[PDB]
């Protein structure tokens, strides 16, 4: 599940760091610098076929 | 009986041209040899009164893509009633 | 205020004319003639200090490309030159510019107690000018042995670079203190 | 609600007024639960927007 | 070519006829350190991939698609020349370039810069 | 011995013939054994920090790494 | 010991090479070659920050920091001319304690900013935290902050994560040709910009991307776009301009 | 003499009219003999007055201590084209300390012709006086004695009645400690930032404008005029075998009457402080510190102050050197965690922010020392506050770095039970209110 902050704005800011230590290689991130200005993804899926719930 | 009693005695017993190159560390002993002195040096390490490795744990192998003779079989041994360790090795090529 | 950016004004800009003086040539000449031709830029540091005296005591963008144009080199090496020292005014600033004491070789002997009556009576935020341009109030470096405690240093930018003068008054009090501004808006200069 | 974006969501959040130069945001109200400490120097005309949170941060006065 | 190694390493025929590249790889311009350097690596050219056309993952159908990144590192350029002539591939190797050490003094910021001669 | 197992006290079983049943009885008898240890080892239970600190090879404190430049470098390094 | 990177030596003339003891371990270098590249030929890879191969030679960051057995203090390596015969060696525990300490000093006032920095998985401030410094920093107040300014459409800049090394205002000074980036202010609170609103408008002006080790100036269009350990990197050459 | 060495006649003095007695432009000067057969001091050659220094046994003053003629040697016996310039620190940097603005004030045309014997002793061919930003009257005076100079021909082309030609400039800072730094020196006259370069290129060799340059201060070099005329022997023989020269000392802080005419070097800091300047405020009881030199000097107690001379060597084997001789003693009456915590605010203050110990280093001595001011912080913090000195001192660029990290290192040595006491109450304070 990804969470978000109780503003509004989501968690995630697409540091890569679950997808280069997800074991299982399940994870796939896309990012782009919104017209905002932070950093946030616009492709963030989770093949949950490959996923193996070890909380990495 | 540990590492270094057994350096000294398959220093001094073990015939010579059979261990290459021989090493010793906390890691491990280990007696390389020259792939064809194999079947003779596990039969004097098997049978010996001082050295007498009875178990074969495991038969390794490494590839190194890098020198001459690629392939690296590692053989790990046991002695139960010494409690000690000996890993042969050797260096193998792809014919 | 001490910002090393500039967020352009409409009283200072870029593209604002500005040139010495029609007088000030000589001294620029004069200046530019102590140093070998070829490092004219030995001579930023007065130039800069006759560009500030001859504003008003604060140093605009303009002046800055001035100067640099003056000793032919690129003007951001005139920047870094006005925003390393401290006797810069790169924000507006009164005629009368007052100045606090020092901080450690001052404050031993108790002068923390002045400036307080500087800044609360008859003064407004530090770095600000009065509804006209008369008195600021910054900071200043002793300049050696504090054997007076209170002591304030005003600048005459009033005059211009021909009656520019630097004094430093001792012994000062929140009545002194008075008496001497009171003297500088009237006009007549303090003894010292 | 979910029909606004979180982009456009976080825009109409008002900005905190802080009476510092620099404010340290840590994310969640807990330390623990929010994004890394991130000291912004507000001191431009507009708000200083936290690149963890989002959060914008403006000085009213010194 | 003498690849005779092809014929029992058991890998099919159609990839014992590749045109592959031996190279050392450069170091990175974004970071100072030269800790990767001295290696040489074979550079299969796999550059046949696209995009599935669901989620957007990358799709392969080569399979040397990353041997020469993950594994397969050589210490030298003799041993890729030899590793590559034995299982009988086109290598055509590549000569690394290497930074020249120049004389650099820290007292030459402060030169004569002339004299004020007449010009 | 790798871990504690010096402090701890247990006894090896060990069999006579090589049958199925002497196999079975070793089996029940290494349970009762390693129930034993469990025992020893929740009396001898002493406090102190579970990872090591020698050398860097331990995540920082999630409520570390989020307040020290450091720590975060680490976490970052090694995730 | 073949030289870091396989760097080739240029010797003027074999007569001029003066010999000098890095580790126990005699090495010939011709006139100059400050101790840094000495230690580069003998095979030992010197921490620097600061120094350059193609920009001049300043010895601010102090952490090339090296020891000679004829000097009071441990001197910079990076700009200490080689001497016939010295000492320079680095496993004394004076270096590594002076390297602690720099690191220790240029982490003080460093942003936590890691996971959102775009030069996060190749920065060399923190690969080279991880091998040459000590961990658990003692640091606890409040660290310094400075304003995002604005240059080009196509550097994007944070200077919140900027070590004061003054490597991009050498490289605009010297390579670049064009001085419009400079080192303002005095002590801790130099910003390093140009006082003015104005753009870096230079032909080779994106090179201070790659210069500056840390991510404070980063490439606007590739703004948080991929990681550096997700691409796969290939040597080609270009098409655009004839010098290839 | 040997037994004490003190006691000054009112002749033996070297700065004479210091407080503005008479008018120190021409006719003055001429009168104490100031421009006085000049013509033969400088046409006796070169290495005679190289010569005169080394034997003359000549300390350096207002600085870090070193022989003045050994420094004159190192300048270039013949020149390969570069010309020679010889820049005077008048910068008198670190407040607290004003024995250059009276010097200045009141005897101009002692360290010009200074400044001339100098320059035909290193065969210069200009002079740099390099004044304070904030010294506008005096740098106004200074130049009126020198345009005088100009007129009466001492200066110039045949300078003195002799073929040697000299120049005298005047170039004014704007007001930075570090620009007092031998090296921001010739940085900033260069014309940009005054942020010290580093040692190998020695000034010698290659520093203003890339030509051979020796930096002197304004005291060291205006005691050069009296040191010919009035020979070798007239002050050699007062101090030891290496520190002579009478230094002045400009005694302020808790002490009443702070005088300050010069004296022997080698004089004791309970007679100095007891015969000239009155006595200390409130008595010798109190003497709660004292700091020998200026404000970049580790502190000395009360415990040692006493029977230990203004010598170089013997104040750097007290660990604690004598910069530019002008004592802070400290009374009682006043906390001396507050006035470290501010001497460590000033050097936050003026540090160019170049190299990276002093950068944040400077400043986390700040904050440590807000901390701690009022008992903020731990007992253990006393330990992490020397590794922090001992990291800023010796890897750093220029000496500030040290005169940054002595204060802090010299209060944590002399003084931490005083620490100890405030880190006590306050956690006591912690403890009672709940
Ligand atoms: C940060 C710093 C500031 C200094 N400021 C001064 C100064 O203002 N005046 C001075 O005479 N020496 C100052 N010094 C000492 C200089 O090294 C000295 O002036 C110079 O080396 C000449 O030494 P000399 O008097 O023996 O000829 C300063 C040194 C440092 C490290
Ligand atoms: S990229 Fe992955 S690890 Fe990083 S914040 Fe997003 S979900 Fe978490
Ligand atoms: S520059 Fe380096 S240390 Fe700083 S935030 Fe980016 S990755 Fe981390
Ligand atoms: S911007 Fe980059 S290159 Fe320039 S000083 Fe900062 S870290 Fe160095
Ligand atoms: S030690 Fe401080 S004053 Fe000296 S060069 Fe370094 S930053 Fe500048
Ligand atoms: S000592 Fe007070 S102004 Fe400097
Ligand atoms: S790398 Fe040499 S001092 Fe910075
Ligand atoms: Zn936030």
Redesign the interface.
């Given at each position: 599940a990804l969470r978000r902050y109780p503003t509004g704005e989501e968690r995630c800011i697409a540091c890569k760091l679950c997808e280069a230590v997800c074991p299982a290689q399940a994870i796939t991130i896309e990012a782009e610098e919104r017209e905002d200005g932070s950093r946030r993804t616009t492709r963030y899926d989770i093949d949950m076929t490959k996923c193996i719930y070890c909380g990495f | 009986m540990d590492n270094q009693f057994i350096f000294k005695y398959s220093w001094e017993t073990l015939p010579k041209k059979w261990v290459k190159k021989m090493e010793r560390s906390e890691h491990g002993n280990r007696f390389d040899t020259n792939t064809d002195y194999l079947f003779q040096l596990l039969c004097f390490l098997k049978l010996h009164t001082y050295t007498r490795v009875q178990v074969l744990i495991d038969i390794c192998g490494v590839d190194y893509p890098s020198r001459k003779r690629r392939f690296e079989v590692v053989y790990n041994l046991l002695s139960t009633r010494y409690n000690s360790r000996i890993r042969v090795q050797t260096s193998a090529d792809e014919v | 205020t001490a910002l090393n950016y500039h967020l352009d004004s409409p009283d200072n800009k870029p593209d604002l004319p500005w040139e010495f003086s029609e007088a000030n040539q000589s001294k620029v000449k004069e200046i530019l003639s102590?140093?070998?031709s070829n490092?004219k830029?030995?001579?930023?540091?007065?130039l800069?200090?006759l560009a500030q005296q001859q504003n008003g005591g604060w140093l605009p963008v303009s002046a800055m490309n001035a100067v640099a144009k003056v000793?032919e080199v690129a003007p951001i090496?005139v920047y870094?030159?006005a925003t390393?020292?401290?006797?810069?005014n790169r924000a507006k600033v009164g005629k009368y510019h007052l100045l606090v004491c020092?901080?450690?070789?001052?404050?031993?002997?108790g002068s923390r107690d002045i400036e307080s009556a500087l800044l609360d009576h008859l003064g407004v935020k530090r770095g600000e000018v009065t509804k006209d341009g008369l008195f600021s109030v910054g900071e200043?470096?002793?300049?050696?042995?504090?054997?007076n405690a209170p002591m304030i240093?005003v600048a005459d930018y009033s005059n211009g670079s021909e009656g520019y003068?630097?004094?430093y008054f001792e012994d000062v009090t929140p009545e002194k203190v008075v008496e001497i501004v009171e003297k500088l808006r009237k006009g007549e200069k303090p003894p010292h | 609600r979910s029909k606004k974006s979180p982009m456009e969501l976080i825009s109409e959040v008002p900005p905190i007024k802080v009476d510092g130069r620099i404010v340290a945001c840590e994310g969640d109200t807990n330390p623990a639960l929010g994004h890394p400490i991130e000291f912004i120097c507000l001191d431009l005309n507009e708000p200083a927007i936290c690149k963890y949170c989002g959060l914008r941060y403006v000085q009213d006065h010194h | 070519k003498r690849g005779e190694i092809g014929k029992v390493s058991g890998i099919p025929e159609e990839h014992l006829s590749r045109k592959v590249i031996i190279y050392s790889p450069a170091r990175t311009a974004t970071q100072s350190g030269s800790g990767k350097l001295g290696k040489w690596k074979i550079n299969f050219v796999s550059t046949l991939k696209w995009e599935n056309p669901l989620m957007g993952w990358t799709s392969t159908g080569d399979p040397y698609a990353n041997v020469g990144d993950s594994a397969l590192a050589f210490d030298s350029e003799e041993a890729a020349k030899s590793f590559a002539e034995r299982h009988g591939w086109d290598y055509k190797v590549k000569k690394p370039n290497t930074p020249l050490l120049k004389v650099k003094s820290?007292?030459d910021?402060?030169?004569?810069?002339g004299n004020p001669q007449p010009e | 011995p790798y871990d504690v197992y010096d402090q701890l006290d247990f006894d090896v079983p060990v069999g006579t013939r090589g049958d199925c049943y002497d196999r079975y009885c070793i089996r029940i008898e290494e349970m009762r054994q390693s129930l034993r240890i469990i025992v020893q080892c929740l009396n001898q239970m002493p406090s102190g920090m579970i990872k090591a600190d020698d050398r860097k090879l331990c995540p920082p404190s999630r409520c570390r790494m989020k307040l020290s430049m450091e720590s975060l470098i680490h976490h970052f390094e090694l995730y | 010991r073949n030289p870091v990177g396989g760097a080739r030596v240029h010797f003027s003339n074999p007569e001029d090479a003066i010999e000098v003891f890095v580790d126990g371990y005699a090495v010939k270098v011709p006139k100059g070659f400050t101790v840094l590249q000495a230690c580069e030929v003998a095979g030992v890879d010197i921490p620097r920050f600061c120094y350059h191969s193609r920009l001049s030679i300043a010895?601010?960051?102090?952490?090339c920091?090296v020891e000679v057995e004829k000097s009071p203090?441990?001197v910079?390596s990076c700009?200490?001319?080689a001497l016939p015969g010295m000492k320079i060696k680095t496993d004394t525990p004076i270096a590594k304690?002076?390297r602690e300490?720099?690191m220790?000093?240029?982490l003080?006032?460093h942003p936590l900013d890691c996971p959102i920095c775009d030069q996060g998985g190749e920065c060399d401030l923190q690969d080279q935290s991880m091998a040459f410094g000590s961990d658990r920093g003692?640091?606890t107040?409040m660290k310094?902050s400075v304003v995002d300014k604005n240059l080009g459409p196509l550097v994007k800049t944070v200077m919140t994560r900027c070590?004061?090394c003054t490597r991009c205002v050498r490289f605009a000074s010297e390579v670049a040709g064009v001085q419009d980036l400079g080192?303002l202010?005095?002590?801790?609170?130099?910003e390093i910009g140009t006082y003015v609103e104005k753009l870096m408008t230079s032909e080779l002006s994106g090179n201070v991307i790659d210069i500056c080790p840390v991510g404070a100036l980063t490439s606007k269009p590739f703004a948080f776009k991929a990681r550096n350990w997700e691409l796969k990197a290939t040597e080609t050459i270009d098409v655009s301009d004839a010098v290839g | 003499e040997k037994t004490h060495f003190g006691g000054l006649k009112d002749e033996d003095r070297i700065f004479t009219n210091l407080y503005g007695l008479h008018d120190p432009f021409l006719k003055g000067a001429m009168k104490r003999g100031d421009w006085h057969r000049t013509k033969d001091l400088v046409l006796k050659g070169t290495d005679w007055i190289v010569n005169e220094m080394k034997k003359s046994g000549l300390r350096g003053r207002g600085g870090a201590g070193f022989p003045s003629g050994l420094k004159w040697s190192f300048m270039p016996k013949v020149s390969d084209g570069?010309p020679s310039y010889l820049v005077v620190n008048a910068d008198?940097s670190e407040?607290?300390?004003?024995?250059?603005?009276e010097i200045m004030r009141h005897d101009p045309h002692k360290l010009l012709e200074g400044c001339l014997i100098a320059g035909v002793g290193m065969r210069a061919s200009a002079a740099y006086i390099y004044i304070?930003?904030?010294?506008?009257?005096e740098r106004l005076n200074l130049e009126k004695a020198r345009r005088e100079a100009y007129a009466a021909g001492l200066l110039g082309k045949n300078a003195c009645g002799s073929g040697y030609d000299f120049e005298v400039?005047?170039?004014?800072?704007?007001?930075?400690?570090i620009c007092g730094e031998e090296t921001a020196l010739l940085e900033?006259?260069?014309?940009?930032?005054?942020k010290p370069?580093?040692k190998?290129?020695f000034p010698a060799?290659?520093?203003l404008?890339?030509?051979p340059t020796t930096v002197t201060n304004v005291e060291t070099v205006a005691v050069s005029p009296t040191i010919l005329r009035r020979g070798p022997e007239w002050f050699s023989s007062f101090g030891r075998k290496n520190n002579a020269g009478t230094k002045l000392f400009?005694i302020?802080?808790?002490v009443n009457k702070?005088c300050?005419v010069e004296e022997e070097m080698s004089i004791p800091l309970k007679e100095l402080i007891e015969r000239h300047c009155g006595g200390v405020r409130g008595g010798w009881d109190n003497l709660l510190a004292i700091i020998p030199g200026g404000?970049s000097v580790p502190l000395i107690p009360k415990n040692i102050c006493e029977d230990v001379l203004m010598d170089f060597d013997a104040l750097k084997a007290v660990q604690s050197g004598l910069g530019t001789a002008?004592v802070?003693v400290m009374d009682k009456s006043?906390d001396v965690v507050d006035?470290i915590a501010?001497?460590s605010?000033?050097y936050?203050?003026?540090?160019?922010?170049?190299?990276?110990?002093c950068?944040?280093?400077?400043?986390?001595l700040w904050?440590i020392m807000e901390?701690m001011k009022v008992g903020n912080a731990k007992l253990e913090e006393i330990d992490?506050l020397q590794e922090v000195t001992?990291?800023?001192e010796?890897?750093?660029?220029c000496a500030l770095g040290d005169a940054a990290a002595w204060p802090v290192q010299g209060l944590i040595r002399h003084f931490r039970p005083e620490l100890e006491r405030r880190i006590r109450e306050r956690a006591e304070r912690e403890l009672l209110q709940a």
């Open positions: - | - | 102590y140093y070998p490092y830029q030995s001579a930023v540091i007065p800069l200090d000793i090496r870094e030159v390393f020292y401290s006797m810069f020092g901080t450690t070789p001052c404050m031993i002997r200043m470096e002793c300049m050696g042995c504090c054997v240093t003068t630097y004094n | - | 820290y007292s910021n402060f030169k004569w810069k | - | 010895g601010n960051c102090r952490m920091l203090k441990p910079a700009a200490m001319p304690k002076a300490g720099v220790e000093f240029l003080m006032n003692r640091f107040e310094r070590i004061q080192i202010g005095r002590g801790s609170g130099e | 570069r008198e407040p607290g300390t004003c024995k250059d603005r304070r930003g904030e010294y506008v009257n400039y005047i170039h004014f800072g704007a007001g930075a400690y900033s006259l260069e014309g940009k930032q005054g370069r580093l190998p290129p060799n290659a520093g404008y890339g030509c400009c302020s802080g808790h702070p300050t404000s002008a802070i006043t006035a501010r001497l605010y000033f936050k203050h003026e540090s160019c922010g170049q190299c990276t110990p950068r944040e280093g400077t400043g986390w904050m901390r992490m001992k990291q800023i010796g890897h750093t660029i």
